[PDB]
With several copies, the nearest count.
Chain A
Amino acid sequence: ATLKEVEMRLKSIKNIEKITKTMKIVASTRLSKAEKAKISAKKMDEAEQLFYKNAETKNKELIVAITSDKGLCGSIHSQLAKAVRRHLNDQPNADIVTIGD
């Protein structure tokens, strides 16, 4: 009725909270592995960067973009895309390699 249609829909929202809750706790675990890995990667990179400055940084194009295969990451998927597309104006026929579903 009215009563029951409020009540079942409310359950939906409650289950959704539990799923989003659980998933966010789990996100916090992954972000730490992701950061540790990033440090080591960035530091390896820095050593070639010393080089590249002193060399002088200087100058079809390729586009690469970076995502996970899993979704629920908010607007990462499409904001990053939006910047891919903006630079798709600087050449229409550019070859885009997409790293992540």
Chain B
Amino acid sequence: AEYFRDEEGQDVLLFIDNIFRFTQAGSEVSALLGRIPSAVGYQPTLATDMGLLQERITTTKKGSVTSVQAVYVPADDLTDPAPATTFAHLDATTVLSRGISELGIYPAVDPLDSKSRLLDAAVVGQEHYDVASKVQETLQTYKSLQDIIAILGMDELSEQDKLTVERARKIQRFLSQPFAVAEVFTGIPGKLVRLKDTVASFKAVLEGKYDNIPEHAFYMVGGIEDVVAKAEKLAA
């Protein structure tokens, strides 16, 4: 990577599946070396060894390198020292969790455990941020009330909460997007939506303008236009 960035002076990309194996490999060697474990088995030279790597993928005036890293985690504990210190050296993250895979919604990136420094009101527009803001709020209310919902019905719940929830369930299912490289697996032909298109589709859907048609119309389809087509399909 360094040779492309520098010598040929071209921008690069990097993929790793999985870079957890890198921290794991250290911990194995560490014991025998004469070093003693830092906490829960892992090498005490963990912080330094992560650090050096993530500064050597860095962005200069000679090339800038966009990276995609897949971190493996045992039983999804993220309070552990190895997943945790990587998140600081990442400007944006897309935490992928088991629940959203059980919901039958691939992709499985959690929407409520996502962060970005790339999402601002002038980095991608004021408008882009306000459409994303509203998605974030809606699902966080819907989660707040999962307890209450289960304990008692929605007729014993508030009418106001029920709008947020009804919006939120539809918005969760809408997040889905079958893939054209796992067309087989998904069971549905792949779809793609542009960045510009994506905001628009979510903007409308939030204001109630396309909440009134099935929650399965939003399951496993891409942008807004695919949902309207799937409704026709459903209707027959």
Contact = CB atoms under 8 A, between A and B. Distances in A.
A touches B in complex, CB < 8 A: yes
Interface of A: 1-2, 9, 12-13, 16, 18-19, 21-23, 26, 29-30, 71-75, 77-78
B79 A23 contact: no
A19 B156 contact: no
Contacts of B79: 1-2
Contacts of A75: 153, 155
A12 B156 contact: no
B152 interface: yes
Nearest to A26: B156
Contact of B151 (A2, A16, A30): A16
Interface string B176-211: 000000000000000000000000000000000000
A35 to B, nearest CB: 17
A87 B95 CA distance: 51
B153 A23 contact: no
A91 to B, nearest CB: 26
Contact of A12 (B77, B147, B152, B155): B147
Nearest to A73: B156
Q: Ordered nearest first, which 6 A-B pairs have the shortest CB separation?
A: A22-B147, A26-B156, A78-B155, A72-B156, A77-B155, A19-B147
Contacts of A71: 155-156
Q: State the main secondary structure of chain A at its contact with B.
A: helix
A44 B155 CA distance: 28
Nearest to B77: A2
A23 to B, nearest CB: 7
A18 B155 contact: no
Given A9-B147, A13-B147, A26 B153 contact: no
Contacts of A12: 147
Interface string B159-175: 00000000000000000
Contacts of A19: 147, 150-151
B145 to A, nearest CB: 9
A1 B75 CA distance: 14
Nearest to B144: A22
A71 to B, nearest CB: 6
A26 to B, nearest CB: 5
A95 to B, nearest CB: 24
19 contacts: A1-B79, A2-B79, A12-B147, A13-B147, A16-B147, A19-B150, A19-B151, A21-B147, A22-B147, A23-B147, A26-B148, A26-B155, A29-B156, A71-B155, A73-B156, A74-B153, A74-B156, A77-B155, A78-B155
A26 B151 CA distance: 11
A23 B151 CA distance: 9
